[PDB]
Design a protein around this ligand. Structure first.
Ligand SMILES: [Cl-]
Ligand SMILES: [Cl-]
Lengths: 152, 152
């Protein structure tokens, strides 16, 4: 059953994944908890592998054309504006520049619109932020079960 | 005479350009001023055209290889993190997630490092944020000289 689009789902899963990870750090009898947390890291590892398999498989489609090019155009505009904003000025300056550009008929920064670039290209990558966090999660789970022995 | 690298210069010029534009809006006898401002828009138009000519010419170099690929890797990481940060949570959440990623050995968002992607690809674009602002500047200059007639 396909409930929603994989693009919409991907971002939901990634976000949910991150806030769940943060919630686990707060949680950390300190053995039953770490066994539940290991199980969860394993679960997320499995789902993530499937996410990757899915996007890796959906790379054979030729389709869209102008959309891929439109995303490049947006990426250029966003990179220019973002880089300037992140390396120059204070809040007042950043605001005045946004206004200047809006008054000139130039949309402000909008990275969300570039989402397709990530889901299309992360599969060509060797490692990924999520893969890295999952490994870190695993190493966290391991160090916890080694230190905290409660299961009698 | 080449004083500095074109990449470093480009970003300086773009930024300087933007804050000069803002300073002009504040400025706006309202004829001598608009003639100085037109002249300036013409000047910047000329410099920008030369900037484009330069980067358009410097597109024949095969060189770097891994650097181009490294930028793609960074673009993926930055897009993931940025998009999540821009579509989810409050300040506290965004901060906790940054910490989570840092504690997991994942650098935070850094678009400045992707500067090469803009200077390499903006030349393939039909229109550009700067081109758009310059046109807007010109139209501003024009509407000012039409309304404010002082030169007797
Ligand atoms: Cl642009
Ligand atoms: Cl990534």
């Amino acid at each position: 059953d396909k409930i929603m689009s994989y693009n919409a789902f991907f971002w939901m899963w990634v976000h949910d994944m991150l806030i769940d990870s943060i919630k686990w750090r707060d949680e950390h009898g300190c053995n039953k908890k770490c066994i539940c947390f290991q199980k969860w890291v394993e679960q997320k590892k499995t789902e993530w592998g499937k996410i990757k398999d899915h996007f890796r498989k959906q790379k054979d489609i030729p389709k869209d054309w102008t959309h891929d090019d439109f995303l490049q155009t947006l990426l250029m505009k966003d990179l220019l504006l973002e880089i300037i904003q992140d390396t120059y000025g204070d809040a007042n300056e950043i605001k005045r520049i946004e206004a200047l550009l809006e008054q000139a008929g130039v949309g402000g920064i909008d990275f969300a619109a570039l989402a397709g670039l990530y889901t299309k290209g992360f599969v060509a990558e060797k490692d990924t932020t999520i893969d890295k966090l999952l490994q870190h999660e695993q190493k966290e789970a391991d160090k916890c079960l080694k230190t905290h022995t409660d299961d009698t």
